[PDB]
Amino acid sequence: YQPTPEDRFTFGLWTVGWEGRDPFGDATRRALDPVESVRRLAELGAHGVTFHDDDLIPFGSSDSEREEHVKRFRQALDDTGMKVPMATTNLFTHPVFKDGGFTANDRDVRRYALRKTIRNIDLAVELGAETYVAWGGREGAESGGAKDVRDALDRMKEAFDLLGEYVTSQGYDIRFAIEPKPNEPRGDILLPTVGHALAFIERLERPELYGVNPEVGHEQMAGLNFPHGIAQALWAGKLFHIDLNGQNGIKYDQDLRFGAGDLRAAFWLVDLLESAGYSGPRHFDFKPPRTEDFDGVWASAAGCMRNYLILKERAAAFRADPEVQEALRASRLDELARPTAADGLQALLDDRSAFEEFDVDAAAARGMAFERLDQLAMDHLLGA
Template sequence: MNGYFDGIAPLKFDPNSSELAFRHYDPDEIVLGKRMEDHLRFAVAYWHSFAWEGGDPFGGRTFDRPWFSDSMEAAKAKADAAFQLFEILNAPYFCWHDADIRPEGATFAESRKNFEAIIDLFEEKMATSRTKLLWGTANMFSHRRFMSGASTNPDPDVYAWSAATVKLCLDATHRLGGENYVLWGGREGYETLLNTDMGQELDHMGRFLSMVVDYKHKIGFKGQILVEPKPQEPSKHQYDYDVATVYGFLKRFGLENEVKMNIEQGHAILAGHSFEHELALARELGILGSIDMNRNDYQSGWDTDQFPNNVPEVALAYYEILKAGGFTQGGTNFDAKIRRQSLDPVDLVAAHAGGMDTCARGLKAAAKMLEDGVLEDMRKERYSGWQTPEAQSMLGADLVTVAARVEAEGINPQPRSGRQEILENIVNRYV
């Protein structure tokens, strides 16, 4: 088979090009003392880019990819196409689920054999490619066996199958030098409380995650274990609802120092938050690990997983990431898919190029805001009253002492402007 992306040259940084090129993403540009590529750490998502067939809730497959069949030959052809795209994009990283890369077998052993053969192929390809593995994960939500969850399933055999699957995928991630391992509980929740023992399911989920962490240390995996929050879809309610919910779960099981967050823009919106809210909270809690970069269509009530194209939104996200010190082992994974009417190979290349340019613009705007310090100076000034000895002493006092001070000093506070519009205007100067 000829290369799927034949005829498409590797993309270069050329702001004035009339051809397909990067116009803002220059991997070698220095931003806050670090190369742009090392800040952004882009990853191509194997599932949306190569496994998704172009369906939506009301229609099936629209894409016609030469590897769309359940055979090992097709899986190998898919890997050939993937690494060809990685080369065109000069992508630093990629990510996968087990089900993305191998055909399903009739038994676990057969699926494992198929999976390990593709991991062998990946290892061979990665030996001559600059593209590394950002993270691996297990798909424990698509197959019908997971319709009632994976670690939270009422059937102990499904729990066992899920544990074996995660072990297999974590072993492979470790073998390929992956820098993270992600768990997303797509079915870890419920459709109705009428048939759900929530306490038992949460206990099982906590035990399962503890086993994953223990195994990470047993095999010497140095990557981060990440949980990806999402509020619903496909489940009515998922236990990993948002960053705050997951943090409470981690605290309950003593895992807050072992597990961090992989935060997705689209999931943050579905939870009723902004992306920057989830990032800021994870930063404050010390659990910001990595991100999935995409966007939702705000006219649709569901997770459309589109490539990012909103620079102001992206800039505010990277502002929070830079405030956290930037990525260490995490990165920017494009958990995004082209539209089901975008049928050609070049559409997939252009989507990534546009997303990478959007992130580059957002990163530079965020870096400039942070460097100039205007937002942080105004934030500091707003809370400056807390720097006085009297204010600090209240934080160690009891309620009676604080109340007595109000009357003794005749405290009569007057409201002060939060200056929201001024701050929004300042952000707009950068984006």
Template sequence: MAAFPEISTVQYEGPQSDNPLAFRWYNPDELVEGKTMKEHFRFSIVYWHTFRGTGSDPFGPGTAVRPWDDGSESVENAQNRARAAFELFEKLQAPYYAFHDRDVAPEGASLAESNANLDAVADVLAEQQQQTGVKLLWGTANMFSNPRFMHGAATTCNADVFAYAAAQVKKAMEVTHRLGGENYVFWGGREGYQNLYNTDMKRELDHLAKFFHMAVDYAKEIGFTGQFLIEPKPKEPTKHQYDSDAAACMNFLRAYDLTDHFKLNLETNHATLAGHTMMHEIDYAGAQGALGSIDANTGDMLLGWDTDQFATDYYLTTQMMYYILKHGGLGSGGVNFDAKVRRESFEPIDLFYAHVGSMDAYAKGLKIAAAIRADNALEDFVSQRYSSFDSGIGAKIEAGEVNFSDLEKYMLEKGEVTPNVSGRQEMLEAVVNRYIDRV
């Protein structure tokens, strides 16, 4: 039985369309900078918010109406839910999806039972992937919901919990590999601390690194060649998480000899919680050769927590796509909709309205970003701003041909600094606005 019988496959109708169940900007086959939009985005739908989110909040139970879900934690219900999920993926023309192990299959009374439940649902996932052509962007393990992880998983103070987490990741990696997952993500929801008085930070970081090296070794053992990704987030649920932002993650990876094995999965809402913009995080990761994938959402700037809203702001999506294009794209990653409909948007059709609107916003952002790049509207200015390093003393500085004494001599002879070019921030912001108006 169809989960969304009243909805047909969403089609591209163009910018003049007023149909909320049609794409205005996302045309999968349209070429932008030599690649189709489908190839640029590799859109992915998350399983957790979309098919496990109920609309509950700290002040009340769920509101979502989901006719395909009987509310039980049975394996049979999980299998039925998987079939409904793939109907949505296919009708949205989303080529990928992503999940946590506990999203798709209920946790059992033991590790063995949990593993068996996951295998039983994975059978249906494999069947649905074969029927629809939808692929797995990435899998991961939920090591933050169960009370056993109250002190963390890989950074716990309890060795048995560390062992359980390792076993859980082992199984999640096996299922991800079986389903052809192109990446595997680690999000350290509780890998951090609430209070330093009771925390040995160095020991916890050492343990986290050992855990990641074990994962690398096991991937080689089973032949999993997908990309490992770390997802930065500064806080919530813990006061301080060790993967707080892109820079902290890169520092950790370098310190523990893991840079060859991991890239970053960046999220807009996590960037703002860290006090950064998403374009900052993308540009930083890209400059380090570590841009792997993005979770596509946004936060409410008036609220200080992770609201996971669907992004519809063209200015935001333009900034994101500009820096993704600058660094050559997302490789094996994708634009993954880690976003949830609001509690008040409780009908099944709202899942379609939300995804269609945001897919269009990213497509519009891509077109704007590509137009800016085609005209070198920002690149030329940036090149000119740093032109003093292209020749003379600047070129010698970059080449490492001078030292402090050389530079002192240079300035004693020159006498004073002469300004070279204004920053022109206001002009550049207006330039971007013109492209947003034009495309």
């Protein structure tokens, strides 16, 4: 289960670079130079890294300091063969964003958030990124009078439409991936789930330019089924990026390494990504726990990839097993994939087997055999 860059594993600079500050805690690790992180991730078999503007260039930097920081980063990329597939903007840390970026009640702040985004789109493109994530972590509220949501959604649409006009004006090849989260750091965050973000995108001026960036722990921290939401994103053709991590339950977002958390959901996730032939990088958005020193940071990163690769093997073995394939037919997964009424409405209406002569008791008595199926799944996950 050793990763190679051909597995397309990517990491944010802010993942392994998290210094361990929390609501109740000072930093437990020193800051990492981005160059060190590129080198150490490449040694572990990562394929690339991703960044926020403020991860690569200290906020408030001069043009000369900006150029220097980018030059050193590109040298480390060249040195390692690491790629930069995705970038994003920090619209959450600085206090100016305390009520939002694109949906801040102050109009001046909204306009600033857009200028800051567009500066970093240009930089993303220069570095070869083809995906641009937007996580509106400060869009939302703690109280009901503070944010008129219809107005905030108008603002949010305006901002994304302006970004789409910008990329089109420049001829850039980049696409946007909007990241839902239900809460934290706002009491409630706008576009709280994959569904709300899919729904919002089809109201944009140029929907083809936008998809979702679901994160495992985000859907889980609302108690939702992450493989289900990924399936709906896939069904819609809108899975433009994914953030992989672990979460134990409905609570604060833990950002555990991938595989930790809800292991059975991680299994079903990998089975789905691999069966659908998802083509995007396997991006980890996780935090090594603040208990760890730097050796533990790199071990937690390595574990992300290891767990992905173990689950990929077990899911493939599950699908290839002739006993599983029989069990899937026993449970009528084949029938689920057949159209209900390719014969058409009128044919259905006139079909006595669908109503007047349907034996409901005989159909109700047929068991679904889902427990045999799932125990096969469990035995394959465990290697039993």
